[PDB]
Scaffold this active site. Structure first.
Site, PDB file in Angstrom:
ATOM      1  N   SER A  13      10.115 -11.718   6.191  1.00 37.68           N
ATOM      2  CA  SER A  13       9.524 -10.802   7.162  1.00 37.68           C
ATOM      3  C   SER A  13      10.522 -10.433   8.252  1.00 37.68           C
ATOM      4  O   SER A  13      10.767  -9.250   8.512  1.00 37.68           O
ATOM      5  CB  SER A  13       8.266 -11.424   7.772  1.00 37.68           C
ATOM      6  OG  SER A  13       7.337 -11.791   6.767  1.00 37.68           O
ATOM      7  N   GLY A  14      11.116 -11.440   8.897  1.00 37.55           N
ATOM      8  CA  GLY A  14      12.063 -11.172   9.964  1.00 37.55           C
ATOM      9  C   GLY A  14      13.369 -10.576   9.483  1.00 37.55           C
ATOM     10  O   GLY A  14      13.963  -9.743  10.172  1.00 37.55           O
ATOM     11  N   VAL A  78      22.442 -19.178   1.442  1.00 35.14           N
ATOM     12  CA  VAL A  78      23.356 -19.632   2.483  1.00 35.14           C
ATOM     13  C   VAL A  78      23.547 -21.134   2.335  1.00 35.14           C
ATOM     14  O   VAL A  78      22.573 -21.896   2.304  1.00 35.14           O
ATOM     15  CB  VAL A  78      22.817 -19.276   3.877  1.00 35.14           C
ATOM     16  CG1 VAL A  78      23.824 -19.663   4.950  1.00 35.14           C
ATOM     17  CG2 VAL A  78      22.484 -17.796   3.957  1.00 35.14           C
ATOM     18  N   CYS A 161       1.612 -20.394  10.564  1.00 36.58           N
ATOM     19  CA  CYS A 161       0.193 -20.065  10.658  1.00 36.58           C
ATOM     20  C   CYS A 161      -0.650 -21.333  10.725  1.00 36.58           C
ATOM     21  O   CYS A 161      -1.148 -21.812   9.701  1.00 36.58           O
ATOM     22  CB  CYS A 161      -0.258 -19.192   9.486  1.00 36.58           C
ATOM     23  SG  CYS A 161      -1.886 -18.421   9.733  1.00 36.58           S
ATOM     24  N   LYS A 304       4.356 -19.912  14.799  1.00 34.20           N
ATOM     25  CA  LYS A 304       5.207 -19.296  13.783  1.00 34.20           C
ATOM     26  C   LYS A 304       4.330 -18.405  12.914  1.00 34.20           C
ATOM     27  O   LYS A 304       3.785 -18.830  11.894  1.00 34.20           O
ATOM     28  CB  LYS A 304       5.924 -20.363  12.965  1.00 34.20           C
ATOM     29  CG  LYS A 304       6.830 -21.255  13.792  1.00 34.20           C
ATOM     30  CD  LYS A 304       7.355 -22.422  12.978  1.00 34.20           C
ATOM     31  CE  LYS A 304       8.077 -23.421  13.867  1.00 34.20           C
ATOM     32  NZ  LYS A 304       9.172 -22.774  14.641  1.00 34.20           N
ATOM     33  N   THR A 305       4.188 -17.149  13.330  1.00 34.33           N
ATOM     34  CA  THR A 305       3.367 -16.178  12.627  1.00 34.33           C
ATOM     35  C   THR A 305       4.171 -14.908  12.387  1.00 34.33           C
ATOM     36  O   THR A 305       5.151 -14.625  13.084  1.00 34.33           O
ATOM     37  CB  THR A 305       2.086 -15.838  13.410  1.00 34.33           C
ATOM     38  OG1 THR A 305       2.432 -15.220  14.657  1.00 34.33           O
ATOM     39  CG2 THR A 305       1.266 -17.093  13.678  1.00 34.33           C
ATOM     40  N   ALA A 306       3.747 -14.141  11.379  1.00 36.55           N
ATOM     41  CA  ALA A 306       4.343 -12.829  11.157  1.00 36.55           C
ATOM     42  C   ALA A 306       4.054 -11.890  12.318  1.00 36.55           C
ATOM     43  O   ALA A 306       4.861 -11.002  12.617  1.00 36.55           O
ATOM     44  CB  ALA A 306       3.833 -12.230   9.845  1.00 36.55           C
ATOM     45  N   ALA A 307       2.910 -12.071  12.984  1.00 33.39           N
ATOM     46  CA  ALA A 307       2.615 -11.288  14.179  1.00 33.39           C
ATOM     47  C   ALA A 307       3.621 -11.580  15.283  1.00 33.39           C
ATOM     48  O   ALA A 307       4.019 -10.675  16.026  1.00 33.39           O
ATOM     49  CB  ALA A 307       1.192 -11.573  14.656  1.00 33.39           C
ATOM     50  N   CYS A 339      -3.194 -15.352  15.383  1.00 30.88           N
ATOM     51  CA  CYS A 339      -3.687 -16.044  14.105  1.00 30.88           C
ATOM     52  C   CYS A 339      -5.083 -15.425  13.764  1.00 30.88           C
ATOM     53  O   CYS A 339      -6.068 -15.783  14.465  1.00 30.88           O
ATOM     54  CB  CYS A 339      -3.674 -17.556  14.349  1.00 30.88           C
ATOM     55  SG  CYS A 339      -3.420 -18.485  12.783  1.00 30.88           S
TER      56      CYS A 339
END
Ligand SMILES: Cc1cc2nc3c(=O)[nH]c(=O)nc-3n(C[C@H](O)[C@H](O)[C@H](O)COP(=O)(O)OP(=O)(O)OC[C@H]3O[C@@H](n4cnc5c(N)ncnc54)[C@H](O)[C@@H]3O)c2cc1C
Ligand SMILES: [Cl-]
EC number: 1.8.5.8
Length: 413
Positions: A13-14, A78, A161, A304-307, A339
């Site tokens: 995502s990031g 990596v 999440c 730690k969320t995608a939002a 969340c």
């Protein structure tokens, strides 16, 4: 030694979001992503997948189809980070140098910390919404549940999440009432934490649900062993150390212990715990000024969320632009995160808060209530927003939306 002005570690995502934004700043030919996986997943869907509401196929697309056009996909892992010389090692024996580095390696799952997993997943009645190999086993275990204990866990580590481990519980309990098996189910939430949720407003709401539906919640209880063939689970009492309990299950959803990715743990860019050591407000690395971090792999003191990644991408976009002009960053990241707590097959408590763990709700109405609207938003609108807006660099959180919504609530007051 191959060189890139901006090197993005991780194609999640990031990573995909930052690569899309940096492409506009420096050109697509000056950006590279280091990502091994051939598939890219919108993980928030896996909660509904394990509940039977959504298909696993709809949550994933080929990694090739989300790489920003013109950006080089360095398909590899990596293996080493050498920031004192602005270079990176790779499991293809390749070295890559960078002018700026963006680290977005997510969080790592460690089912092996639980005995004996993942080998226990080869048996029925046990699943996990956190892995593509096990999310469908949650749904199979929910369908085939006959009678007994339905146990849901929360490990003694940081997680991504934090609401997901209890989302599937509320969904499982609703499925038992739906299909006439609630009288047979004994629903247990064994969490290592001492609270149901970290924000008072939403924790109180989730507590109303737990009482109304007769859910058993044991705090400071951690899963340590799975005897899958015996269909038994062993929990340790964090409150009274040394006390353990063996309990049978007709259904066991396991939330795995989680940790920083192995390549980052002892890396020079990590803090004492292994997370990427970044500034709380600018996301710039605290030691190496040309290194930046975003997402689950950082030590940003929020969920730690995608939002949170969406809100962080907008801040980090400005941070690197300002640094590229030699100026000093001014816009501070507020720790925004959200969340979408699914409480039923058509209700969602949308929790939004910041660094101070105080509500930061986007919409005028009270989001601590279970809402069909917030469910319809999460299920049928967020996925479109994710693939088409965020991964293309057109979504930096709902801050602008929150302000204009509150402006109209001033036009009315
Ligand atoms: C079941 C579930 C439900 C969720 N629901 C929600 C929700 O409703 N709302 C919400 O906001 N968030 C939710 N989340 C959280 C969200 O999925 C993550 O927080 C988000 O994906 C974080 O993005 P990231 O880029 O930091 O990590 P990721 O998106 O996981 O990206 C990590 C990437 O790094 C790559 N990588 C790993 N190691 C290496 C290496 N050594 N070298 C190179 N690449 C590497 C991986 O292949 C992966 O592509 C949920 C998570 C789960 C598991
Ligand atoms: Cl933006």
């Amino acid at each position: 030694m191959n060189h890139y002005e901006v090197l993005v570690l991780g194609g999640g995502s990031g990573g995909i979001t930052m690569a899309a934004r940096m492409k506009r700043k420096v050109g697509a030919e000056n950006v590279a992503i280091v990502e091994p996986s051939e598939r890219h997943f919108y993980q928030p869907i896996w909660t509904l997948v394990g509940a039977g509401a959504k298909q696993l196929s709809s949550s994933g697309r080929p990694t090739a189809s989300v790489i920003p056009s013109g950006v080089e996909w360095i398909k590899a892992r990596v293996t080493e980070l050498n920031p004192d010389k602005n270079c990176i090692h790779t499991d293809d024996d390749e070295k890559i140098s960078y002018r700026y580095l963006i680290i977005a390696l997510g969080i790592q799952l460690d089912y092996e910390k639980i005995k004996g997993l993942p080998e226990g997943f080869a048996h029925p009645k046990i699943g996990s919404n956190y892995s593509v190999k096990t999310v469908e086993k949650t749904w199979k275990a929910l369908q085939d549940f006959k009678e007994g204990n339905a146990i849901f866990t929360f490990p003694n580590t940081p997680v991504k999440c934090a609401g997901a481990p209890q989302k599937i519980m509320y969904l499982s309990e609703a499925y038992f009432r739906k299909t006439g098996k609630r009288s047979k189910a004994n629903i247990i939430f064994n969490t290592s934490l001492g609270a149901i949720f970290g924000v008072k407003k939403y924790a109180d709401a989730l507590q109303e649900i737990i009482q109304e539906r007769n859910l058993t919640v044991n705090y400071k209880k951690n899963l340590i062993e799975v005897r899958a063939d015996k269909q038994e689970a062993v929990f340790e009492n964090l409150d009274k150390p040394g006390e353990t309990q063996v309990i049978s299950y007709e259904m066991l959803h396991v939330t795995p212990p989680m940790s920083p990715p192995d390549v980052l743990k002892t890396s020079p860019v990590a803090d004492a715990a292994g997370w990427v050591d970044v500034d709380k407000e600018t996301l710039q690395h605290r030691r190496y000024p040309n290194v930046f971090g975003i997402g689950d792999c950082t030590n940003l003191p929020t969920s730690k969320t995608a939002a949170a990644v969406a809100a962080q991408s907008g801040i980090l976009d400005r941070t690197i632009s300002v640094i590229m002009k030699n100026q000093t960053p001014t816009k501070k990241y507020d720790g925004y995160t959200s969340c979408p707590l699914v409480t039923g097959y058509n209700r969602v408590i949308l929790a939004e808060f910041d660094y101070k763990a105080e509500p930061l709700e986007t919409f005028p109405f009270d989001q601590s209530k279970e809402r069909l609207s917030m469910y319809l938003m999460k299920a049928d609108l967020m996925p479109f927003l994710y693939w088409n807006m965020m991964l293309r660099g057109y979504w930096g959180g709902p801050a602008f939306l929150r302000k204009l919504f509150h402006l109209g609530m001033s036009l009315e007051h």
